[PDB]
Design a protein around this nucleic acid. Structure first.
Length: 117
RNA sequence: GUUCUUUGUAAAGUGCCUUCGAAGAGUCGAGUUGUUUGGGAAUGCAGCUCUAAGUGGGUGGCCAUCUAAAGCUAA
């Protein structure tokens, strides 16, 4: 079979938007190994990881229809990156032209600077 | 203002003490199709398939604030 196996739970908070909903569209369709769930304090998530039996968890917070915090972990052990997003450009813009076949596994470019911390 | 009628163990009020002490469901809410929103898009609504709780629930930053699903009301 395969060495690497993941599944990710997708749940955001209440007070959704088209910035939000556009994002859950993209990211939900981007993770073919992910499970997608209704939206919902801080405890129950790792337990939902027990119910749907999921090894990757993330969460989208909405404060005043502004603050989007992404909580990030792999339950129950995590650890978590609490996160905040700004200047969101989803896939849905006119100047992003793409049409992508579904479910693919990308290739990730990233900088070597990360390891510096 | 004058005058008549006041009635029956008739109401009501205030404080202290003792026993008690109910709070609105096809709703709320969930997914979705529309529709609108300057509110960022269901924000609000309508439809559909599903549909709760009682130291609860809503809304918002451990905390604060309020009590939905019934109703009247002059300037």
């Amino acid at each position: 079979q395969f060495m690497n196996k993941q599944r990710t739970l997708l749940i955001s908070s209440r007070g959704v938007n088209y910035r939000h909903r556009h994002l859950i569209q993209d990211l939900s369709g981007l993770l073919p190994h992910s499970r997608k769930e209704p939206k919902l304090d801080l405890q129950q998530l790792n337990e939902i990881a027990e119910l749907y039996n999921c090894n990757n968890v993330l969460f989208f917070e909405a404060r005043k229809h502004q603050d989007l915090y992404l909580w990030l972990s792999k339950p129950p052990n995590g650890p978590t990156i609490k996160f905040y997003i700004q200047n969101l450009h989803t896939m849905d813009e006119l100047n992003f032209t793409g049409n992508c076949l579904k479910g693919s596994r990308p290739v990730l470019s990233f900088d070597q600077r990360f390891e510096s911390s």
